């Protein structure tokens, strides 16, 4: 909460209070060592808002994505059914195949589940698009057929999505890295602008 | 009963106040005085005159020019101590401990 | 009327408000354009002087510390922001009287040059052109 | 060791210091009750108030961010005001507090700029209303001072009056309101002192004989004016 | 939530209005033309309960199932029990108060006094005193 | 989008209001006694009024009259470049910075006497309770 | 003469705080004028 | 732990209720209030006299301290007031006899 | 007036203190007691003063304003206080 | 004068640029080296655009008081009539009296003047104007008598007079000195800080 | 309708943006007044902790 | 603001910043001939080359 305003004079002081005398060393001094604490106090409230409002917005954004039920490239949803979980672990770390035990039709299904799911996941602005359509377009065409006489067709495929997919992930770990990093060399550098301010207090002087 | 006091009447509200149970001496309101130019005034003219920031802190003192000090408290003296002495014994008058010297003290005052 | 329109008398409390954010914006964007430029030349140059001498790069007076408007100026005939003392009523003018078997103007009150009033009342005000002899239409 | 003993009579003798303290606290000492003053005249934001404004009722802008909600004077106040003091009377057209448009600048040039233009003051933004007593000894103070400056002088209690209202009326945080109230006064003081100034210097003028109908009526009397 | 002072705001307000209260005294009863009898001086050996119901609420909070508000309703007690032997020991021994305590007087003197003739304000000074002129 | 505006209100007279105009009214016409007077005035040698003279005595400061075309049209205009002064140091006063926040006399001043006598009285309060817990420190 | 940030009516216009303009109209004027019908357009 | 400082705020506390209780009509607050209002305190009550019989400059630094604290003249016939009135003005007098008081912004 | 310069105050005090005894250090350390205090309560003014005026403030608007309500007004006050004796006189 | 807006991709990069390596010790120097540098322009912006701003207003002001024709107790007016500034400087720094050589109706002039002279320069918020106005009150009274015999009597208000001036004129020096010295430790600030800027970025890294 | 209403569809550009701003500033508003308590709080203990 | 049934229709955009609130105007009654009808000379009649003037320097 705030304060209340401070007071004011009711009688209008104009310049009567102004010294009359000039100031010397040791005012000097303070007017100084003021000056570096109100930097140093901005510098903390400039790491203090910052920390502050993006922990409050990533807090809401992953508030917001549990509401709507996100996976992403770490599956850490609970909420998912076992089937939607295995075909989403296979777009993101297995490889996508259908089965020799399903009928030609529920292959077509199965297709067009990953399609869709993947098209969802991926907008045209994502790298991994084009490679992941193409791999499901010769699961499409390769459906009336085995896994191992389709492994050696969609294999050229499957190389290209793999290259992109291990590339969102090693970019997401180094994302993780650099910003935690970051935050710790920030928040070190707050503590230390902290306690010289602690010492240039203890050493103020004035009333 | 009370009616809304708009703001062009509040100047006259400020030096006529409406009756309370607690009123101030409407009659002294325009003597009531707190100045806060006394002691830079003070140093500026002594400054002026040729002292030190010591020597005007020596010779400052509290300005006389304040609010007048209530009469009561030097003639009705003896009785206000003795209730004072009263409440002081009796937690305050609860229960209506102090009403004699209370009592004698407005009538002395008030004189019907 | 002229002359009072150049200092803003006509114009309401959020014009000069706006006119004086336009001012301060304006002076604003072109101190920042010149910090930018003048660090851009100190940083090639490597010297402070620089610096100092983008200092004079742009002093008529100064802005305005107060302004006053007309619609700061109180009116009305109950407003007591006008009344300071009583005026006698031998000086106070009167309201105009007529009175007949076929019109009057006692059924109803126009109101002053400013603060003006519909005569008829509510009820009547759907029918206004009944009570008339001729009457003029708007244009829409 | 607790804290603050000896300094809470009002917790340990359940006295309220307003009905608010009364009602919350559930003391029930005040015989009347309690009339919430509600958050729009609590706090607020400074408005445009004339008709002739096509911003009527909508907050002032300023260079900085502010909070739009405005404070609402109270124009249906209901009959009974038990307490009619200033305390409880300039809550309904100020609030006590100030209002909630004051900036936090980031930069001490900000602060330059928008004093330099005229947009900022901490007189008018960082400040609270100022209580009956704090008005009235500001007034005795310049009574004195101008009394000091002359005595025979005829326009002294105008001056004193337009000081007073625009004290009253808070013309440090509503400098534009309280001169819409205290311009009367200032024009009352320059008639005064035009009057004062003929009458020092001998100043008349030949006067016309009296009309053939200076009175309307032979029968009305003819009061004579100086 | 106001308890309204005129239920019969319209009508009641007219013939009979509420005046401003009396809160001096009572003003209802008789007026007692006796002085309050002294009461026995106290001493330290009525601050048994005080002293021990402060020192059980002071443990319980320092553990921290008791509060605070507790503490200082026990503490308040026990000083005001301090209190009144320290201000029975003021009264008996500075001599200011001994006409204080043996005063009395009757609502007939009281209305007989004229001292009500000088209860007038003063007025403050000249603010050119401050100059010396 | 001002100028040339629609009708907005209507045009009407109420039954039997009066016009006090009669059917030659077109054919009236006005006439002031200004212009012959002032002829006569200047034929006859009467007592001219001081407008004619350019310069004013109504005043100690000198003025001089502007004529609008005409002698009975004019404007005292002031010569004097006033000088103005003013009994008030320079570099006195920073009204942008909040002063009741810094620490010194300024600050105090900014602020008020009640504030500082209330500081001080703080003050002695806290030092006499730091007085007794000195003593019962020192005094183990 | 007292509250000059507060008395707006009482302050100069405009353009006198710009320090730009036989005998020359007046460099300063008030905002009091307005309170005279004759202070501006003439007694004609 | 601290006394003087907690009755000052308490004093303060009670006296602003009183006035407001005066204001909304509240005698029953008002003289909780009064009864409230810390009559037991022996140092006061000593200092009590001895202010009533000051002069010079210890009387005016706390008359100044009291105008700075309460300027607003209570009615010369309200003895509630008055009373609360010299048991303020009391206890700064025992605050400055123990320590002065030291008002001007000027010091060092 | 500075917290360096008090707490050096308050060392003076102390070991003048024990030089002198518990007996007659009351009349031959008066002006070692004096200094000490007046540069805690410059310290004490400095660091709350902030509160001082909220409480002043508050008192004079009758304890009405939202930063008024509760009893954080004098809490913080005293909370400071007992804070800058804590951090001077041990 | 502005640069344009830098240039921005035609087609959308939206994390493809990403890094998938975590970040180097030098580049964690270099970043907070950066950091540093930003800090130090921001106090020099700060710096400059204050002194510029307080330049502009304070020159401006003044070009505002010559061209309304001002005097102050510094008398820097060339535009003064001689007798308005030996009044003035009789007000400023000398002693207000009326000489014998004159008739009693240009004693009573002569003090009109001084007090409208007096009374347009100090308003009611100044301290000096009450003993100003006194003294002239006091000159008012004492006309029809010689300067001998006026001295003794307005002398106790003269003093007060004497002093509310030199009171001014300290206050007046004093302001201008501390003014220079603030004025200057500023700028040697922001020089230091300008030096300290040059080094990092000679010591800065990357492109 | 009603419910379009709740999503401000019936609302223009201008009003949109009013409302965008309202939430800025509140929100600067509360931070601000936050940070000032904290620094306070953290000051008058001298801790870091009371900050974080 | 564009939209006729906008209030503040012909004003510029309000930002939390401080704006030069002088607004770009479209061309809306242009001369016959246009000789340049390249993308280059018609986008200046509904937008600025060089961007709008409401831009930010945050001071954080
Ligand atoms: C603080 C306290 C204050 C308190 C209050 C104090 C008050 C103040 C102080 C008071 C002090 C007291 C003072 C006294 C009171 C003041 C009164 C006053 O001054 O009046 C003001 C007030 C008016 O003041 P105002 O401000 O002007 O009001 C607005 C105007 O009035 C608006 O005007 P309008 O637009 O409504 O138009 C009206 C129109 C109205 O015009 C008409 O009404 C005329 C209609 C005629 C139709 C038929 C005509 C046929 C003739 C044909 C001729 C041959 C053909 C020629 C063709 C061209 C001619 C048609 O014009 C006229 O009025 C014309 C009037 C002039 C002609 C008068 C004719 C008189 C003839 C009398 C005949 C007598 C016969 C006796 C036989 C007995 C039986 C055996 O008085 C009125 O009320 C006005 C109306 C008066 C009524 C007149 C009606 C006459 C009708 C005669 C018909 C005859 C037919 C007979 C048939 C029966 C036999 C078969
Ligand atoms: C029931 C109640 C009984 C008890 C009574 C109680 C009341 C007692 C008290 C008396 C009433 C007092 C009440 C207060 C009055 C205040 C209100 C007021 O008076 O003014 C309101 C009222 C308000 O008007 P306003 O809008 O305010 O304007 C005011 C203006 O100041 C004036 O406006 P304006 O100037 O525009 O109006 C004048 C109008 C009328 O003015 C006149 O005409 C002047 C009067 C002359 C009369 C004599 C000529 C008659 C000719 C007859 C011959 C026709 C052919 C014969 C056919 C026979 C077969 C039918 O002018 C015209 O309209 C155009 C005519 C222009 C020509 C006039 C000069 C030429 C005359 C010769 C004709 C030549 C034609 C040649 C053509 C060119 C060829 C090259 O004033 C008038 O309306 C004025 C005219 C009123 C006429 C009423 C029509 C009825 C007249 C008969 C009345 C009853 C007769 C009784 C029997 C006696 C006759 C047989
Ligand atoms: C000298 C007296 C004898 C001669 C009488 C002259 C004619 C009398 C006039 C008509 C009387 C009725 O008038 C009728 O009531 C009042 C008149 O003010 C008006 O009513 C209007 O004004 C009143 C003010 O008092 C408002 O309260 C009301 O809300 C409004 O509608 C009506 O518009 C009118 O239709
Ligand atoms: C025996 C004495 C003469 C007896 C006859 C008296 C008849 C007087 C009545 C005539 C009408 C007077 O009506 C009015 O009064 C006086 C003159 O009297 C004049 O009044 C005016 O001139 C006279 C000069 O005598 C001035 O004193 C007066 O200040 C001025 O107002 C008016 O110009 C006139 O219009
Ligand atoms: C072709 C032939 C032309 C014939 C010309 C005839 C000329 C006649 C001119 C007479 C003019 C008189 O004019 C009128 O007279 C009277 C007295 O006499 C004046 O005086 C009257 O009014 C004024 C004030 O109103 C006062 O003097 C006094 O109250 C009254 O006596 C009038 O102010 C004046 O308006």
Redesign the pocket.
């Known amino acids: 909460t705030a304060l209340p305003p401070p007071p004011s004079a009711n009688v209008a002081v104009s310049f009567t209070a102004a010294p009359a005398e000039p100031l010397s060393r040791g005012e000097v001094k303070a007017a100084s060592l003021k000056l570096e604490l109100q930097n140093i106090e901005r510098e903390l409230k400039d790491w203090w808002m910052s920390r502050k409002i993006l922990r409050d917005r990533n807090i809401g954004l992953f508030n917001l994505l549990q509401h709507h039920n996100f996976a992403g490239l770490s599956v850490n949803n609970a909420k998912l059914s076992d089937s939607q979980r295995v075909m989403w672990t296979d777009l993101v770390q297995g490889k996508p195949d259908v089965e020799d035990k399903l009928s030609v039709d529920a292959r077509e299904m199965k297709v067009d589940m990953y399609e869709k799911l993947f098209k969802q996941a991926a907008d045209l602005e994502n790298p991994c698009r084009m490679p992941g359509v193409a791999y499901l377009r010769c699961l499409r065409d390769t459906l009336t057929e085995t896994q191992s006489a389709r492994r050696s067709s969609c294999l050229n495929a499957f190389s290209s999505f793999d290259a992109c997919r291990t590339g969102l992930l090693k970019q997401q770990s180094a994302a993780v890295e650099n910003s935690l990093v970051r935050q710790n060399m920030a928040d070190v550098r707050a503590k230390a602008l902290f306690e010289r301010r602690a010492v240039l207090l203890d050493l103020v002087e004035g009333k | 009963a009370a009616s809304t006091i708009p703001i062009s009447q509040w100047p006259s509200l400020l030096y006529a106040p409406p009756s309370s149970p607690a009123n101030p001496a409407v009659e002294a309101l325009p003597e009531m005085q707190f100045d806060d130019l006394h002691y830079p005034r003070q140093m500026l003219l002594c400054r002026g005159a040729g002292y030190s920031l010591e020597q005007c802190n020596r010779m400052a003192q509290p300005d006389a020019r304040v609010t007048p000090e209530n009469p009561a408290e030097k003639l009705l003296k003896e009785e206000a101590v003795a209730a004072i002495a009263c409440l002081s014994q009796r937690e305050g008058g609860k229960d209506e401990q102090c009403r004699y010297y209370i009592e004698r003290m407005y009538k002395l005052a008030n004189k019907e | 009327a002229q002359l009072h329109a150049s200092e803003g008398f006509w114009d309401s409390e959020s014009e000069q408000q706006e006119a004086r954010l336009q001012r301060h914006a304006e002076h604003r964007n072109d101190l920042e354009t010149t910090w930018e430029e003048a660090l851009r030349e100190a940083t090639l140059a490597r010297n402070f002087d620089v610096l100092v001498s983008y200092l004079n790069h742009g002093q008529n007076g100064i802005p305005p510390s107060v302004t006053w408007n007309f619609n700061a100026m109180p009116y009305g005939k109950e407003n007591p922001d006008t009344k300071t003392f009583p005026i006698p009523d031998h000086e106070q003018p009167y309201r105009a009287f007529s009175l007949?078997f076929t019109a009057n103007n006692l059924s109803g009150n126009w109101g002053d040059y400013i603060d003006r009033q519909d005569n008829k009342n509510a009820l009547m005000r759907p029918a206004r052109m009944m009570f008339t002899d001729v009457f003029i239409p708007t244009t829409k | 060791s607790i804290l603050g003993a000896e300094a809470f009579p009002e917790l340990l003798s359940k006295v309220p210091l307003n009905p608010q303290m009364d009602e919350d606290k559930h003391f029930n000492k005040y015989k009347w009750g309690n009339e919430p003053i509600p958050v729009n005249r609590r706090t607020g934001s400074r408005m445009n108030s004339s008709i002739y404004d096509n911003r009527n009722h909508e907050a002032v802008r300023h260079p900085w961010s502010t909070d739009a909600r405005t404070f609402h004077p109270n124009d249906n106040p209901e009959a009974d005001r038990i307490n009619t003091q200033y305390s409880n009377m300039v809550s309904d057209s100020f609030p006590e507090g100030g209002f909630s448009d004051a900036p936090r600048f980031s930069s001490n040039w900000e602060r330059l700029l928008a004093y330099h233009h005229g947009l900022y003051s901490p007189e008018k933004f960082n400040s609270t209303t100022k209580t009956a007593d704090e008005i009235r000894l500001a007034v005795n103070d310049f009574a004195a001072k101008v009394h000091a400056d002359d005595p025979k002088n005829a326009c002294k209690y105008l001056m004193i009056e337009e000081f007073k209202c625009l004290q009253s009326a808070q013309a440090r945080i509503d400098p534009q309101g309280a001169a819409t109230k205290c311009v009367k006064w200032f024009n009352e003081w320059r008639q005064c002192a035009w009057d004062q100034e003929k009458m020092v210097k001998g100043y008349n003028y030949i006067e016309d004989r009296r009309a053939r109908k200076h009175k309307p009526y032979i029968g009305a009397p003819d009061l004579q004016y100086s | 939530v106001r308890n309204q002072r005129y239920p019969a705001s319209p009508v009641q307000e007219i013939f009979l209005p509420e005046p401003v209260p009396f809160v001096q005294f009572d003003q209802t009863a008789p007026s007692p033309n006796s002085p309050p009898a002294p009461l026995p001086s106290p001493s330290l050996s009525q601050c048994e309960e005080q002293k021990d119901r402060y020192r059980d609420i002071s443990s319980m909070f320092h553990r921290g199932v008791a509060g605070a508000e507790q503490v200082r309703e026990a503490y308040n007690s026990m000083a005001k029990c301090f209190r009144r032997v320290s201000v029975a020991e003021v009264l008996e021994s500075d001599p200011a108060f001994r006409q204080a305590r043996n005063f009395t007087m009757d609502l007939k003197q009281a209305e007989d006094d004229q001292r009500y003739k000088q209860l007038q304000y003063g007025r403050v000074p000249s603010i050119l005193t401050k100059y010396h002129l | 989008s001002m100028d040339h505006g629609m009708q907005y209100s209507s045009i009407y007279w109420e039954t039997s209001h009066?016009?006090?105009?009669?059917?030659?009214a077109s054919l009236t016409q006005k006439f002031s006694w200004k212009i012959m007077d002032d002829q006569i005035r200047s034929f006859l040698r009467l007592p001219k009024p001081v407008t004619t003279e350019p310069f004013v005595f109504s005043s100690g400061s000198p003025y001089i009259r502007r004529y609008f075309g005409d002698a009975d049209i004019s404007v005292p205009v002031p010569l004097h470049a006033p000088a103005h002064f003013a009994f008030v140091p320079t570099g006195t006063v920073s009204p942008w910075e909040e002063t009741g926040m810094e620490t010194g006399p300024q600050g105090a001043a900014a602020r008020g006497a009640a504030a500082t006598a209330f500081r001080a009285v703080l003050e002695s309060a806290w030092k006499c309770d730091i007085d007794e817990q000195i003593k019962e420190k020192l005094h183990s | 003469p007292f509250m000059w940030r507060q008395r707006a009516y009482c302050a100069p216009v405009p353009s006198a705080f710009a320090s730009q303009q036989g005998v020359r109209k007046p460099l300063l004027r008030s905002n009091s004028e307005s309170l005279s019908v004759f202070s501006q357009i003439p007694d004609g | 732990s601290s006394p003087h400082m907690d009755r000052l705020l308490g004093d303060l506390k009670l006296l602003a209720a009183y006035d407001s209780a005066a204001g909304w009509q509240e005698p029953k607050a008002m003289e909780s209030a009064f009864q409230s209002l810390s009559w037991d305190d022996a140092d006061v009550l000593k200092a009590l006299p001895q202010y009533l019989n000051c002069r010079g400059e210890q009387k005016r630094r706390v008359d100044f301290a009291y105008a700075a604290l309460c300027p607003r003249p209570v009615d010369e016939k309200d003895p509630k007031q008055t009373l609360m009135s010299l048991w303020m003005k009391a206890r700064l007098f025992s605050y400055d006899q123990k320590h002065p008081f030291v008002l001007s912004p000027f010091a060092a | 007036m500075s917290v360096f310069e008090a707490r050096s105050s308050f060392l003076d005090l102390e070991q003048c203190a024990r030089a002198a005894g518990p007996q007659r250090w009351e009349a031959e350390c008066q002006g070692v007691r004096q200094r000490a205090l007046q540069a805690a309560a410059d310290v004490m003014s400095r660091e709350c003063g902030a509160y001082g005026d909220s409480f002043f403030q508050c008192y004079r608007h009758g304890f009405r304003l939202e930063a008024c309500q509760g009893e954080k007004a004098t809490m913080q006050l005293l909370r400071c206080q007992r804070m800058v004796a804590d951090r001077l006189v041990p």
């Open positions: 007949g | 009066r016009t006090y105009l009669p059917f030659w």
